[PDB]
Design a protein around this ligand. Structure first.
Ligand SMILES: *[C@@H]1O[C@H](CO)[C@@H](O)[C@H](O)[C@H]1NC(C)=O
Ligand SMILES: *[C@@H]1O[C@H](CO)[C@@H](O)[C@H](O)[C@H]1NC(C)=O
Ligand SMILES: *[C@@H]1O[C@H](CO)[C@@H](O)[C@H](O)[C@H]1NC(C)=O
Lengths: 99, 99
């Protein structure tokens, strides 16, 4: 904000952030992989119809689901509405390249 | 008050029906879109994910919600019933307006 002077008061100029151009997708509370439920560290899981990604809450920026940005807590038999997608781990390609 | 010689009473600009409609609109917006409608266009989101957002806001991970959803829902319903019973218990809670 920026202040301005008035003859008998004060004038405030407030700069704010307003989102626009919304779009809707399909979401799931968690991902079940190898019998383990994965939850996002930040953001939510969204899908465009064929693949699942991770985006921010207030901005759309799809990312490949990875162990780096997800954490595991228990099995996937308790969470209601879980889906059955897979996750990615770059350590396996890193190990494969060391041959 | 009453009607008699000397003075008169004026009706309010907004009727009770309009106030009830405003409250209903606020309730629908806050239970169908979270806090997104308070800053711009309303964005739909399932209620469980909004509750997970709020739990992450208060400093607790969302997995404890996803593993204890039924208990929290039952506690909320019991609390609503208890508020109804307490309000119908003829308690002196409405004394602020009566005074
Ligand atoms: C998104 O919203 C529009 C209009 O509300 C609806 O027609 C559509 O089915 C929704 N879902 C997708 C995936 O577009
Ligand atoms: C969803 O995004 C993927 C990109 O990984 C793309 O290959 C696929 O065609 C997209 N599906 C639709 C229905 O747009
Ligand atoms: C999820 O995928 C696993 C893969 O082994 C399978 O055993 C399980 O039945 C699947 N569950 C559902 C609900 O599709």
């Amino acid at each position: 904000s920026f202040p301005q002077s008035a003859p008998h008061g004060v004038v405030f100029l407030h700069v704010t952030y307003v989102p626009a151009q919304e779009k809707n997708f399909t979401t799931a509370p968690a991902i079940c992989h190898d019998g383990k439920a994965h939850f996002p560290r930040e953001g939510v899981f969204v899908s465009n119809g064929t693949h699942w990604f991770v985006t921010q809450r207030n901005f759309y920026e799809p990312q490949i689901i990875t162990t780096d940005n997800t954490f595991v807590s228990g099995n996937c038999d308790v969470v209601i509405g879980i889906v059955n997608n897979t996750v990615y781990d770059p350590l396996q390609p890193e190990l494969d390249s060391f041959k | 008050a009453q009607k008699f010689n000397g003075l008169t009473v004026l009706p309010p600009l907004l009727t009770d029906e309009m106030i009830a409609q405003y409250t209903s609109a606020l309730l629908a917006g806050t239970i169908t879109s979270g806090w997104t409608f308070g800053a711009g266009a309303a964005l739909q989101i399932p209620f469980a994910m909004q509750m997970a957002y709020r739990f992450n806001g208060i400093g607790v991970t969302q997995n404890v919600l996803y593993e204890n959803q039924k208990l929290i829902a039952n506690q909320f319903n019991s609390a609503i019933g208890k508020i109804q019973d307490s309000l119908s218990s003829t308690a002196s809670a409405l004394g602020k307006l009566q005074d």
